[PDB]
Design a protein around this ligand. Structure first.
Ligand SMILES: Nc1ncnc2c1ncn2[C@@H]1O[C@H](COP(=O)(O)OP(=O)(O)O)[C@@H](O)[C@H]1O
Ligand SMILES: Nc1ncnc2c1ncn2[C@@H]1O[C@H](COP(=O)(O)OP(=O)(O)O)[C@@H](O)[C@H]1O
Lengths: 746, 493
């Protein structure tokens, strides 16, 4: 609704000093011809200069020299706030000096060769930060701000004095611009970047609103995650997008000094952060400054921790200075930092997923030409344990594989450096395969909290089970008020029990896929590692990962493992209690019904499990997963076979009726064996064909009609003889006896 | 401030301390406050620097000198009494100790009132529910919650319109109100509860909540109410009141509820320690923690101490008979050592509970330790009706039900066995309501009727249908053989 809130669009006058008009809008403005109009955009950088060299284009979209997009803006669709401020003072003059492309060739004076013919009767109505193109030649070189005799911008005049003593530089300014791009330079942390925005934008952008009222903003943010996850980059991207000053402090440069100087170095940053407010102070690898008392041995190492704490509390008066720190885990630092007023907030950056990895690949390979057969969707699927930098390395390594393999001797002496070889060259899929398979040792071994991809259709039958799951997990999230109305408290646990390989691990993922919630999976070997290592504290950490990622689902399987280890089913003299389930119960009981955290347990030996875990407020509800029926068997056959060429004379309906009691595991083994037979036959045929005509005196014979394009009935018939049942009737008798003895077993 | 002293050198630190003491003396009557005392004076085992030990002695000398001069008083704040040196806890330096503990529902509500004064609220606040749902939070947490809830609404509106309308003024600034939905969002999303340790407070359960059991109520009031109310009567005669009681019986009969009903009747603090804590102490070989518990009770008098799953340790090692070892362990010995060395005047009562008295060590049943035993039997018909009414006094229900018919239809049941039936019936009703509502909303959306509202709550209350359906799964829990064993133990005495 703001009248001067209008889009900006393409421009044709290669001189940036021109700014457009819109006669219907000029009638709204007081736009006069002369020196300057203040056209205001983002980040406070403007393009202020002479005006009215337009009205060639339509209205509602001001024509502004495209070079004032990288500056003052980012892209199209933006909006300008054009308001005249002509008649600026006439100081001495504005700086003259190039930046990047002038040292390349004759330099002379850098003013009187190429730039002099442009400050003619248009004597630079400008604003420091306006960047453009001006030359007396190839017509592509920048003109940047270096000096400022008058603080506000002016209109130059002859007879002045200029010193091109300055030297053209690198893209310090371009790096600053890349940082300014910010949100469009990262991927895989969509949630974590939205939480920060809503947390810091309001204090920084409109501090007056917070001044007018008494409310408490944040003064400490802590980001913990594995290395190489783009944390300092996030801080720079957030500081630049809001225009707030950014100061960087690193740990090693504070612990590599002498005592007094080291302490005093930490007080200059705060002093050079309050005189540039609103500003941000960023400290990385805080673990190198303030670790726990276990790793803090020495007196001077404590004089530097108390100094930091007393400095943090000196900001309660000032609400426009914010501190963000980075580390790996939160328990690696003194808890005194984690307090109310020092580092209250927390953020888990985490690890990207297929979508985030694909986004990172896209950004990293933007200028990297890729000819063909580069999907980048597959690549994101085989990268399990890669973070940030690693992918970048990948993108470089493959590129090297492109040139190192064949350009090894071509580029030695035949030619000098040229672009027709660099641009003409491309990157293929084989380079990516060699780079990923050969020299990519992932640096990750931690747990993963992300939504899976398994859908309901992958599982067969069990409609009642799915209905029950929806009633338990899905209903409360949508109708909390209905649950409250009847004075009800929903359950927070469920236990699966049944024979092995009947489809219990898939349900925990399908439910999360439908609910759009993260899931965490824990195996029995981890529980045995805790039992033998006698480290039950890790359990707390596990639950901590189920509290900061809500809503989510927590899955425990092979729960009987510990009860199996010590003696048989009954075990040794000792009862059914141990030192690892006690902690699980303790953590379960000390948890609120809110936060939407669900827990699922799986096992195949219900009898041995501690009866104290099925009390109310614990895994109260029990579900019996049975062996699939013939109709379910054909469903599982279709599910497994859908992702292979398996058109055949035989029919899966024929196979299912022959099977009797086959578990789901057996039905994912027939296909594997049949495909193995088919691929062996194909390989043998290929080798014999490739060998015969060349070993024979036949120079050239061509025939490639695929001998094995699909899985035929013969392969399935051969495979059917190599597979049988993998369970005994006695187990089914035990399961049904337990399913009935629950009658009055409470 | 502790760190401000540790962030300097010896001369500067031990000059500021002295100067502060002189300044406090000059402006008498004055007060000195110290925080983060652990950062200054922890136990010597954790101190290595010679300067660190040279900064504690100065404080001791100043504290000793204070007694001679002026009216200055000194107050210090610490996280736990044991975290600091024991030389400060003497006669003349820090003789007096105090605990702050944690606020209760009333305290949380009061803090919300304090922090909501100048803020504008709607009619949907109902801070009582928030206080009930606010478990573990403290004052800072509540202030943060209030600020976050305000910022939710403020950021929603501000980001939407008035960035361009006009320079924000007081009228629009204060025009905005707050709604309970923002509170619920701030509570569910931001829930960094900073409390996971023990708790001490007066419970809310009352005798009316319990079903029947009048004789045990009479037998309980005599043990607790009479000594506190009438000591001179005991003094006139020669008896000294006992300080322990043990409940033995089958599970699901309300043993846990009596220990809190007594406290609610007498308005006394209550503490409950569960069996998992005992097993955690056993495996960790940490019997010292026990002592701390009693100290808390000693400082929370009048109070009641509760222990359940007391037979858990004996069950763990071997079965009822156990392994080769006897009936003793590492924790019960400490409990006896603490009980024997306790004064009667502190009026700290002790309650234990179990369902397998056969394997409890007899040493705890000796005179002076849990000498009075009470048996909690299975609820009867007249009791069962009361339990049903008590559990159903919170939910809306129809009138076709025949509660007495259900009560008589049940035999050998437990209190929980009826609460589970009520929960199952409520689940059936909620599922029916959800299905009906979703089907209704889905059917007419295809029919483009702008106005079609036959709004009737499909099933406000439940009938005999759901209760009889749940009766199919409603079945006995405790075996008759177990009841016979309990009776045999109750007769062989
Ligand atoms: N209903 C089913 N649909 C599809 N696959 C199944 C089904 N039941 C079992 N499976 C197969 O069994 C494997 C998973 O076994 P799982 O059920 O986790 O064993 P357990 O029950 O011992 O945990 C999967 O590879 C899957 O192919
Ligand atoms: N006499 C009773 N009056 C009210 N509720 C009861 C009664 N007996 C059992 N309950 C129900 O049982 C549940 C708690 O059982 P509890 O008495 O704690 O087990 P135990 O007796 O094994 O310690 C409560 O939800 C309570 O409503």
């Amino acid at each position: 609704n703001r009248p001067n809130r209008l889009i900006v669009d393409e421009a044709i006058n290669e001189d940036n000093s021109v700014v457009s008009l819109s006669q219907p809008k000029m009638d709204e403005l007081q736009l006069f011809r002369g020196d300057t109009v203040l056209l205001k955009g983002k980040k406070r950088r403007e393009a202020v200069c002479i005006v009215l060299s337009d009205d060639t284009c339509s209205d509602e979209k001001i024509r502004m020299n495209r070079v004032v997009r990288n500056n003052l803006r980012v892209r199209l669709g933006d909006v300008i706030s054009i308001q005249p401020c002509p008649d600026v003072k006439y100081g001495k003059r504005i700086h003259v000096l190039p930046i990047d492309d002038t040292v390349e060739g004759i330099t002379g004076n850098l003013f009187e060769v190429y730039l002099k013919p442009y400050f003619l009767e248009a004597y630079r109505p400008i604003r420091k930060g306006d960047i453009f193109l001006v030359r007396g030649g190839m017509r592509a070189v920048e003109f940047k701000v270096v000096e400022t005799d008058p603080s506000p911008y002016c209109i130059v005049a002859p007879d002045t004095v200029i010193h091109c003593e300055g030297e053209p530089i690198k893209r310090e300014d371009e790096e600053e611009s890349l940082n300014e791009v910010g949100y469009d330079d990262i991927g895989g942390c969509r949630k974590q970047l939205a939480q920060i925005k809503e947390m810091v934008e309001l204090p920084l952008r409109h501090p007056a609103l917070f001044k007018a009222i008494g409310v408490k903003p944040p003064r400490g943010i802590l980001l913990y995650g594995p290395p190489g996850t783009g944390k300092t980059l996030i801080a720079r991207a957030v500081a630049n997008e809001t225009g707030a000053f950014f100061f960087l402090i690193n740990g090693p440069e504070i612990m590599s000094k002498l005592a007094g100087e080291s302490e005093s170095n930490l007080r200059k940053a705060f002093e050079e952060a309050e005189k540039n407010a609103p500003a941000i102070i960023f400290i990385d690898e805080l673990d190198a400054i303030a670790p726990k008392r276990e790793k803090t041995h020495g007196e001077v190492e404590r004089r530097i921790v108390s100094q930091l704490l007393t400095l943090m509390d000196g900001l309660k008066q000032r609400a426009h200075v914010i501190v963000m720190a980075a580390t790996n885990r939160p328990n690696s630092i003194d808890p005194a930092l984690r307090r109310f007023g020092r580092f209250d907030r927390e953020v888990d950056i985490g690890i990207p997923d297929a979508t985030g990895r694909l986004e990172i690949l896209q950004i990293h390979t933007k200028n990297m030409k890729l000819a063909d057969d580069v999907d980048l969707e597959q690549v994101a699927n085989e990268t399990h344990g890669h973070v940030g930098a690693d992918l970048a390395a990948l993108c470089s390594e493959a590129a090297l594989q492109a040139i190192r393999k064949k350009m090894d001797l071509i580029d030695l002496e035949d030619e000098t450096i040229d672009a027709e070889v660099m641009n003409s060259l491309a990157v293929t899929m084989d380079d990516f395969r060699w780079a990923l398979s050969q020299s990519n040792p992932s640096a990750l071994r931690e747990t993963v909290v992300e939504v899976p991809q398994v859908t309901w259709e992958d599982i067969g039958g069990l409609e009642d089970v799915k209905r029950e799951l929806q009633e338990l997990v899905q209903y409360p999230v949508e109708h909390p008020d209905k649950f409250l109305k009847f004075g009800m408290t929903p359950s927070k646990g469920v236990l699966f029990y049944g024979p092995p390989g009947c489809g219990k691990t898939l349900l925990a993922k399908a439910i999360a896929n439908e609910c759009q919630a993260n899931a965490i999976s824990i195996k029995g070997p981890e529980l045995l590692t805790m039992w033998f290592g006698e480290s039950e504290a890790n359990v707390r950490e596990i639950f901590d990962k189920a509290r900061q990622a809500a809503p989510c689902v927590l899955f425990f399987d092979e729960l009987d493992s510990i009860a199996k280890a010590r003696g048989g089913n009954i075990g040794d003299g000792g009862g059914a209690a141990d030192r690892v389930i006690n902690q699980i119960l303790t953590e379960m009981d000390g948890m609120s019904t809110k936060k939407n955290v669900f827990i699922i347990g799986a096992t195949n030996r219900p009898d041995i499990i501690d009866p104290a875990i099925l009390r109310p407020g614990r895994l109260d509800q029990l579900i019996y997963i049975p062996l699939p029926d013939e109709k379910s068997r054909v469903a599982i056959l279709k599910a497994n076979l859908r992702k292979s060429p398996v058109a055949k004379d035989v029919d899966l309906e024929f196979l299912a009726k022959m099977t009797n009691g086959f578990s789901g595991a057996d039905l994912t083994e027939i296909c594997q064996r049949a495909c193995k037979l088919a691929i062996r036959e194909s390989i043998e045929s290929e080798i014999r064909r490739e060998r015969e005509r060349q070993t024979n005196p036949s120079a050239m014979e061509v025939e490639e009609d695929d001998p094995v394009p699909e899985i035929r009935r013969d392969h399935f018939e051969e495979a059917m003889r190599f597979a049988r049942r993998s369970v005994s009737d006695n187990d089914i008798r035990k399961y049904e006896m337990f399913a009935q003895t629950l009658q009055q077993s409470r």
